[PDB]
Amino acid sequence: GSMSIMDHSPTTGVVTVIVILIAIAALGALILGCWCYLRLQRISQSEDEESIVGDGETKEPFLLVQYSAKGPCVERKAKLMTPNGPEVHG
């Protein structure tokens, strides 16, 4: 039974996914503002945003899981090989 508010509701889950979503959006914004959501991923000087329209939701849900898996796989291999922290390097 809920106690006036909704303690017996998945509010902790809705808040957890909203915080994670807010964090993902904030991270995406940080990458869009600091690297135009491109960060020199290829020849550059022509490529557009690679995450939602450049690659992610442009066609079919395939790019979604593709970016959902490679995004972190690339970000991890990029952070493991390079500093990826503009506070000290590119």
Swiss-Prot record:
Key words of the record: Membrane, Mitochondrion, Mitochondrion outer membrane, Phosphoprotein, Transmembrane, Transmembrane helix
Signal peptide (UniProt feature, chain positions): none
Parts of the chain on the Cytoplasmic side: 34-90
Segments in the Mitochondrial intermembrane topological domain: 3-12
Gene Ontology, cellular component aspect: cytoplasm; membrane; mitochondrial outer membrane
Subcellular location: Mitochondrion outer membrane
GO biological process, one term: response to toxic substance
Residue list for modification Phosphoserine: S51
Main location: mitochondrion
InterPro entries on file: SNN_cytoplasm, SNN_linker, SNN_transmemb, Stannin, Stannin_sf
Topology with respect to the bilayer: Single-pass membrane protein
GO MF annotations, alphabetized: metal ion binding
Record-annotated membrane-spanning stretches: 13-33
CDD domains: Stannin
Family label: Belongs to the stannin family.
Primary role: Plays a role in the toxic effects of organotins. Plays a role in endosomal maturation.
Complex and partners: Monomer.
Protein name: Stannin
Organism: Homo sapiens (Human)
